[PDB]
Amino acid sequence: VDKPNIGIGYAAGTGGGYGPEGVNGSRVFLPFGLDPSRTPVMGSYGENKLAAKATSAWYQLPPRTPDRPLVTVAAAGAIWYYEEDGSFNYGQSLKLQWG
Amino acid sequence: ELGSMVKATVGRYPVYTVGSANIAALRSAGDSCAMADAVLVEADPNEGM
Amino acid sequence: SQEWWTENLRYYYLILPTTDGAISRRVAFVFTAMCLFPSLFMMLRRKHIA
Amino acid sequence: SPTVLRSARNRMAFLSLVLFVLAFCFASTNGWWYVSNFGAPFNNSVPKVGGVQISAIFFALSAIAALWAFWLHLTRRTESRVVDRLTAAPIPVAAGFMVV
Amino acid sequence: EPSRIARLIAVVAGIAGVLLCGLVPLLPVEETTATVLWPQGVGADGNVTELTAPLVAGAPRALDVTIPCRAVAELPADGGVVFSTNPAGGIEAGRNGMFIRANADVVYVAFRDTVAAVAPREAVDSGACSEIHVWADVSAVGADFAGIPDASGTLPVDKRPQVSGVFTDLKVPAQPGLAARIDIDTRFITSPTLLKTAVMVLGLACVIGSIVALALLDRGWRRRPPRTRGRAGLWTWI
Amino acid sequence: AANRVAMLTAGATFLAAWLPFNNGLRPEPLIAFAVITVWMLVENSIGTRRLWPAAVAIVIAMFSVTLAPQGLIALAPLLVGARAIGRVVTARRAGTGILASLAPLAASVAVVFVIIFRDQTLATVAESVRIKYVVGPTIPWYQEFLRY
Amino acid sequence: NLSEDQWFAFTPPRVPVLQTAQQFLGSQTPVLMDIATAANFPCQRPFAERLGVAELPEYRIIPNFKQMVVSSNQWQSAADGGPFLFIQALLRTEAIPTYLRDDWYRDWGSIERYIRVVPQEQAPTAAIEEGSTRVFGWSRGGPIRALP
Numbered sequence: 001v002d003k004p005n006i007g008i009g010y011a012a013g014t015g016g017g018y019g020p021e022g023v024n025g026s027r028v029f030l031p032f033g034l035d036p037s038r039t040p041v042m043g044s045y046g047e048n049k050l051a052a053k054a055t056s057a058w059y060q061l062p063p064r065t066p067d068r069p070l071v072t073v074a075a076a077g078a079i080w081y082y083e084e085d086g087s088f089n090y091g092q093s094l095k096l097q098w099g
Numbered sequence: 100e101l102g103s104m105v106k107a108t109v110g111r112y113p114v115y116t117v118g119s120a121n122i123a124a125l126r127s128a129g130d131s132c133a134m135a136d137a138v139l140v141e142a143d144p145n146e147g148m
Numbered sequence: 149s150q151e152w153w154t155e156n157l158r159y160y161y162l163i164l165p166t167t168d169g170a171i172s173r174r175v176a177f178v179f180t181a182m183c184l185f186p187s188l189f190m191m192l193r194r195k196h197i198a
Numbered sequence: 199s200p201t202v203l204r205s206a207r208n209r210m211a212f213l214s215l216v217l218f219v220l221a222f223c224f225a226s227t228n229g230w231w232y233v234s235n236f237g238a239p240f241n242n243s244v245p246k247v248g249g250v251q252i253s254a255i256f257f258a259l260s261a262i263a264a265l266w267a268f269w270l271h272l273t274r275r276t277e278s279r280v281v282d283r284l285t286a287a288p289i290p291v292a293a294g295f296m297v298v
Numbered sequence: 299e300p301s302r303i304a305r306l307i308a309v310v311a312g313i314a315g316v317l318l319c320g321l322v323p324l325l326p327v328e329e330t331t332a333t334v335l336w337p338q339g340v341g342a343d344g345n346v347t348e349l350t351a352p353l354v355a356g357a358p359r360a361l362d363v364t365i366p367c368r369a370v371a372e373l374p375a376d377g378g379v380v381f382s383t384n385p386a387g388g389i390e391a392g393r394n395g396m397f398i399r400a401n402a403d404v405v406y407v408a409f410r411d412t413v414a415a416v417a418p419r420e421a422v423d424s425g426a427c428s429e430i431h432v433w434a435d436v437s438a439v440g441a442d443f444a445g446i447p448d449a450s451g452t453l454p455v456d457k458r459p460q461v462s463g464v465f466t467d468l469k470v471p472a473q474p475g476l477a478a479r480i481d482i483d484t485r486f487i488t489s490p491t492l493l494k495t496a497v498m499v500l501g502l503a504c505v506i507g508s509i510v511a512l513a514l515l516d517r518g519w520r521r522r523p524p525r526t527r528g529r530a531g532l533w534t535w536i
Numbered sequence: 537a538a539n540r541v542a543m544l545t546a547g548a549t550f551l552a553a554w555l556p557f558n559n560g561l562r563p564e565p566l567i568a569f570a571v572i573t574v575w576m577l578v579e580n581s582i583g584t585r586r587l588w589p590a591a592v593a594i595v596i597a598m599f600s601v602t603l604a605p606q607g608l609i610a611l612a613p614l615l616v617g618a619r620a621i622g623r624v625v626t627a628r629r630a631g632t633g634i635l636a637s638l639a640p641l642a643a644s645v646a647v648v649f650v651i652i653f654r655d656q657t658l659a660t661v662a663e664s665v666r667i668k669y670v671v672g673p674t675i676p677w678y679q680e681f682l683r684y
Numbered sequence: 685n686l687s688e689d690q691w692f693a694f695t696p697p698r699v700p701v702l703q704t705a706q707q708f709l710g711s712q713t714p715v716l717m718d719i720a721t722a723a724n725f726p727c728q729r730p731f732a733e734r735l736g737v738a739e740l741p742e743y744r745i746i747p748n749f750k751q752m753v754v755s756s757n758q759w760q761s762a763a764d765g766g767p768f769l770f771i772q773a774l775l776r777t778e779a780i781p782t783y784l785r786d787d788w789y790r791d792w793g794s795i796e797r798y799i800r801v802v803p804q805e806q807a808p809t810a811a812i813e814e815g816s817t818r819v820f821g822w823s824r825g826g827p828i829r830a831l832p
């Protein structure tokens with residue numbers, strides 16, 4: 001009670017290290033139980049002097065149904081997103097473009 | 100301190116509130132779980148890729 | 149900055165056993181409160197102490 | 199004073215309060231700030247007379263004083279003489295203790 | 299007359315109610331024991347099988363081990379672990395386990411962090427230590443080897459292991475000297491005996507008897523009020 | 537009680553003091569009831585001079601002390617109203633005696649020994665309290681202002 | 685940006701299947717519900733301790749991040765006697781992506797699957813072989829190992 005309660009934690013393995021070879025190389029630990037034999041990865045840490053940019057390859061969405069109302073990705077970094085009411089978080093640019 | 104709960108329950112319905120769980124438990128006579136019905140989980144998160 | 153509604157800090161720092169609030173740094177306040185409060189409650193009851 | 203607080207119960211309660219205040223006072227280290235802390239007796243730990251602290255002694259005395267006040271409360275006694283010796287100027291002694 | 303019998307009862311059931319209630323926390327109970335043994339398991343083909351027993355109290359109250367060595371410590375020319383009490387792959391496995399290692403030259407019986415006995419492996423396989431006793435009860439913590447001139451130890455009582463299973467790396471089927479015995483600390487699982495229950499109900503009926511006798515004793519000193527309360531009123535119902 | 541504005545404010549203050557604190561499975565919803573039901577029984581014993589209300593009040597206070605460490609608040613209405621109970625007791629020293637009117641008041645305090653040690657022994661409660669002291673977060677008495 | 689810490693990664697997009705958290709972990713799977721998330725899940729069964737031994741949970745239910753790291757990892761630590769004593773030495777964690785039904789901005793908590801370090805093929809549960817004694821009310825043979 002005479003000092004602040006400083007702590008930190010991670011969920012299960014989100015924030016881990018290395019793992020086996022993936023699909024496009026990427027010996028990185030995929031959390032949540034994502035199979036690395038079916039999951040490519042991309043990352044901008046290490047190329048800190050290049051202003052990295054990238055665009056995906058038109059992943060095909062299934063027919064609409066009210067039972068799967070989400071499209072989800074994994075982030076692992078600092079990303080710019082809007083909060084519930086206006087407020088921001090610095091991060092970096094990541095968006096999803098329909099079509 | 101009563102409106103800050105009655106409004107939070109009437110608004111935001113269903114979505115999930117500590118009052119909506121109790122209302123559902125009253126209506127269902129006590130065989131409807133409170134938060135295991137709102138939370139949606141995803142087993143095998145590589146079959147949705 | 150220490151806005152006015154954070155005045156309990158001055159007494160929170162006093163009950164911690166550190167160099168800030170030590171054996172000697174408590175007398176100035178406790179011998180004022182302990183001599184002020186019962187004297188107030190006694191001046192309220194009695195109106196002629198002669 | 200024994201001429202302004204005429205009931206022994208009130209003076210015993212005030213003596214208990216003084217002892218409790220001393221017990222609260224003696225429940226911390228004896229550290230000074232930068233170089234006045236060079237050589238102080240208990241500059242790093244709560245004072246102990248061996249196993250038991252000094253705040254515990256004053257608390258065990260305040261509890262006994264409060265029990266004496268409660269016993270003078272129940273039986274409605276006000277003319278006690280030992281409390282006339284004990285509760286004569288208890289603030290000067292409580293301040294001289296800390297000063298010394 | 300109820301003016302004297304009640305005065306007698308309010309004492310003979312008050313003092314007895316204090317006595318029969320103050321001697322409650324001392325009367326006997328019946329607590330249950332719980333002992334995990336080992337082998338207990340033919341396993342895959344004929345060997346012994348590890349066990350999982352996650353005690354909640356942490357340490358048990360008795361940890362007899364006494365494994366054999368001359369025909370048992372046959373790890374493949376370099377041993378990792380013999381009879382750990384925690385899985386070697388845990389986050390803090392050896393920090394609070396037992397971990398009789400083999401180390402390919404010294405067979406040391408570890409503990410929380412401390413080593414409790416050391417023997418040269420080339421001399422411990424050849425049939426010098428017929429026992430590897432690892433007794434770890436509440437009064438003593440020792441790891442005697444029974445046959446080496448100086449292979450023995452003793453630790454402070456606060457170096458008791460944490461038992462969350464029995465995990466070995468041996469392949470011996472079953473030995474006439476291989477064993478293990480863990481006494482779980484089931485001290486909170488008592489159940490009241492017949493004497494304790496009888497005394498409880500007796501000392502709980504004496505209290506009620508004394509209070510009823512006091513109520514009947516108050517019949518002569520009850521100040522009867524003049525019944526001047528009134529009714530509720532509107533603005534209190536609202 | 538017949539003041540139409542001194543009852544509405546009592547209800548409003550009771551609501552404003554009960555809603556933020558006592559809704560869950562804490563023992564306070566019961567300690568706050570035991571305190572007032574010991575107060576009313578002590579007041580019923582002081583006036584209308586009787587001792588069995590002041591004997592059931594001790595049983596209720598003993599049931600309230602073994603709810604939580606903060607449960608000994610239920611003893612305050614028994615300690616502040618002890619001189620008046622002594623006054624209604626010493627009015628019977630001629631009639632029945634100070635023993636026949638304090639033995640029932642002393643056998644009621646001895647129900648904690650049945651409430652606590654009904655399943656476990658003394659050596660078990662001692663070890664439980666020792667563990668809870670050596671392990672968990674407990675702050676001393678001289679840091680009471682930490683609550684406020 | 686070119687700063688040292690301003691980076692990110694990503695992963696192919698996935699549209700989940702979203703099975704609710706009641707058909708997934710029913711009323712028979714032993715789960716470890718933390719101190720905060722035990723009143724919101726009243727139909728799940730917490731893992732049962734019996735005769736000193738405990739049965740190993742299969743999932744864990746966690747409060748939000750700030751509540752977790754200050755109330756669940758500190759209260760139930762292995763250095764204080766919590767359920768982590770035998771869970772950190774026998775089980776590995778894995779995360780599960782969970783979402784509220786319509787509050788996509790809410791950090792309701794998380795769920796963790798437990799994978800045994802030693803598979804249950806070998807190392808099955810142990811037979812307890814219980815008995816009974818008649819100890820008195822003052823024995824206290826030896827203290828308990830509660831000091832980390």
Ligand SMILES: [Ca+2]
Pocket residue numbers: 044047048685686687690691
């Ligand atoms: Ca960058």
